[PDB]
Write a protein that binds this ligand. Structure first.
Ligand SMILES: Cc1cn([C@H]2C[C@H](OP(=O)(O)O)[C@@H](COP(=O)(O)O)O2)c(=O)[nH]c1=O
Ligand SMILES: [Ca+2]
Length: 129
């Protein structure tokens, strides 16, 4: 896989963010994770965590997997990096997202994320508390 440039347009919630990619606005849905909705427990904390990462970064990047690049709603499907740190993994490691929506052929980072989740669960963080 490879990282590509993007710029933040606006944070939306824990697992969606609006970026400019190849000069066009797009909503991205983060691969392999599920944050709580804003109205649910940990939802506001997941939104705030993603927003801080993507806003404070000097450089945001998108990395598509090998399969589908957009979902049925027209959202981009990608791993998002903020100054080289993967948002998807960081949410899981903090217990602010579960590993979820693991479809075959866009699952390159599945085991990296499952290791983060085991660590968050052992530490009883957030969703796992
Ligand atoms: C993360 C991801 C979600 N989706 C779809 C499945 C779910 O469909 P349904 O809307 O029918 O439930 C929805 C979950 O997104 P949200 O968690 O953003 O609601 O997005 C994919 O198709 N591919 C993906 O990789
Ligand atoms: Ca969600």
């Amino acid at each position: 896989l490879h990282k590509e440039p993007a710029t933040l347009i606006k944070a939306i919630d824990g697992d969606t963010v609006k970026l400019m990619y190849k000069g066009q606005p797009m909503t991205f849905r983060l691969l392999l994770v599920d944050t709580p909705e804003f109205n649910e427990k940990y939802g506001p904390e997941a939104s705030a965590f993603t927003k801080k990462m993507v806003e404070n970064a000097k450089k945001d990047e998108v990395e598509f997997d090998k399969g589908q690049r957009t979902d049925k709603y027209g959202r981009g499907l990608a791993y998002i990096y903020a100054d080289g740190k993967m948002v998807n993994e960081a949410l899981v490691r903090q217990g602010l997202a579960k590993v979820a929506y693991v479809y075959k052929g866009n699952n390159t980072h599945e085991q990296l994320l499952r290791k983060a989740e085991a660590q968050a669960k052992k530490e009883k963080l957030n969703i796992w508390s």
